[PDB]
Design a protein around this ligand. Structure first.
Ligand SMILES: O=P(O)(O)O[C@H]1[C@H](OP(=O)(O)O)[C@@H](OP(=O)(O)O)[C@H](OP(=O)(O)O)[C@@H](OP(=O)(O)O)[C@H]1OP(=O)(O)O
Ligand SMILES: O=P(O)(O)O[C@H]1[C@H](OP(=O)(O)O)[C@@H](OP(=O)(O)O)[C@H](OP(=O)(O)O)[C@@H](OP(=O)(O)O)[C@H]1OP(=O)(O)O
Lengths: 283, 288
């Protein structure tokens, strides 16, 4: 946390590009997680839908124990589905949230990067202009230096004198623009290095940490949602109140009693021919 | 208490008319219960199969790869994988159950067919005997009618030899005696067959049908319980999958993340170093 090393590296040039790249990576993690969650909640939603639909067929009709018990365990199926529905709802909510996040953060990063590029460019090209002017100045001065040696004469005439004077004026002007452009460039540069740069990298750091922490929280949420789902279905099938368990329903059937019911019911008939033949004569 | 089927209404019900042999229908109903259940669990393991497939396929389809997060997400997706595995096991169990119930249904159907046909056949035999008796009766009564109509005639007719009323009388008397013996015989035959059917065979048939019904239904109930334990196993196993009996749980992964530390690593890692040629400052130095 703000070590001499970290503070040392944060002061260099590559920093501003580096943590931009980092932030980009973070954005990518976000988008990735979005996609995953979407696919997940999609097919899970599918699962729920069929789960809920399918059990409502079969034995849905309203007189026997077994059929009833089956009806009930299919009911359990339904309950499970409702739980999972709650879960997918949670997932959807999450997705929307992290989407909004990603949007905001991408936009923000774009802005910061633009600003950075602009400022840095301004400084750099200012320096460029300065060093150009420098080159000019040094060139003219180099010629004037070339003036002053294995040479002949020359007292010269009005022409050479005029050339000298003119060149001196030229060098004077070039010198002034040189100096002022240098001071300008250095001013801008130092203003950038001392104030703007650390502010930008500060902002980018803050952003990265923000989005990272948010997403990690989101991951933890996904986790607790999942284990919530699993646990609750787990306690849905086996509520710890045994009378509500699935095995509880499946346990109580008694077919013999239902058969006795069938027959004893049939008691409360049918001739079917097979009436015997009687023998009697008539003399 | 057992011997509920040994009660008065029950015994008189089964010992009653063909209404007993109701049991065929009931066995049919149980068979339809079987088939319906099959249909259901078929649909079930179908869409569960779909779910599992998509689970595994989708889980494996993303990261596959350096910060903490990437790792952690990779892990929780791994957990998704484990879940897919256990649910696959569950599906396998379901399919097995399907096969078993199917075989059961087959057996029971074949048996029902056989028994029913047998019953029908024996009943038919009885009915045929009765019919024969009725025929003999008709013949006898007819010939008696002929006699009683004949003795209203006062004269001789020529046929075999020739004449007469008296001889015709005696002849017809002989005929009717024969027809009468036939009658009595076939009556006794009929009634004997009937009694033997009612007292011996029919009970055995009823017994068999009842036994079959209880067999299939009990079997299907234990099957239901099997399905229940299968589901319990599934959910319990996914449960213990995502939270093992450890430091390698899901909450453990999701909980433990670097963020600040590995960012410090990321920065301190940059330490030769790229310095910008565009931002080299410029100095002003004059010239003599
Ligand atoms: O077209 P490319 O050669 O593949 O380069 C692009 C481009 O970067 P440059 O402008 O420096 O060439 C994008 O910049 P923009 O068009 O959006 O202004 C930049 O996007 P970011 O500035 O938002 O980072 C993107 O990077 P990324 O793929 O992380 O989005 C990067 O692609 P490369 O990193 O593969 O070079
Ligand atoms: O009890 P099952 O062994 O399954 O046989 C029944 C029975 O036929 P049988 O009396 O010849 O044994 C039905 O007859 P009823 O009880 O209605 O008098 C008949 O119904 P239909 O006479 O109306 O055709 C039905 O046939 P289906 O399933 O087409 O309705 C047929 O079942 P099977 O064709 O499977 O033998």
């Amino acid at each position: 946390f703000s070590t001499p090393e970290i503070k040392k590296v944060l002061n260099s040039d590559v920093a501003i590009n580096a943590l931009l790249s980092r932030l980009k990576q973070s954005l990518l993690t976000c988008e990735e997680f979005m996609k995953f969650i979407r696919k997940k909640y999609a097919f899970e939603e599918e699962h729920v839908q069929e789960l809920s639909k399918q059990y409502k067929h079969f034995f849905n009709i309203q007189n026997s124990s077994l059929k009833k018990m089956i009806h009930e365990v299919l009911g359990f199926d339904g309950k499970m589905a409702q739980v999972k529905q709650s879960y997918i709802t949670a997932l959807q909510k999450m997705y929307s949230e992290i989407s909004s996040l990603l949007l905001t953060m991408t936009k923000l990063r774009k802005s910061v990067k633009e600003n950075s590029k602009r400022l840095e460019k301004d400084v750099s090209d200012a320096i460029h202009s300065a060093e150009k002017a420098q080159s000019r100045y040094n060139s003219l001065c180099q010629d004037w230096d070339k003036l002053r040696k294995t040479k002949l004469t020359l007292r010269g005439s009005k022409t050479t004198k005029e050339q000298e004077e003119e060149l001196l004026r030229k060098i004077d002007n070039a010198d002034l623009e040189y100096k002022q452009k240098v001071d300008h460039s250095n001013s801008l540069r130092n203003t950038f290095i001392t104030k703007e740069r650390p502010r930008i990298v500060q902002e980018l750091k803050d952003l990265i940490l923000e989005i990272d922490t948010a997403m990690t929280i989101q991951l933890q949420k996904y986790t607790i949602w999942t284990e919530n789902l699993v646990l609750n279905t787990g306690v849905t099938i086996s509520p710890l109140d045994s009378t509500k368990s699935m095995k509880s329903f499946a346990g109580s059937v008694s077919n013999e009693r239902d058969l006795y019911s069938f027959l004893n019911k049939y008691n409360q008939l049918i001739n079917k021919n097979l009436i015997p033949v009687s023998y009697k004569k008539h003399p």
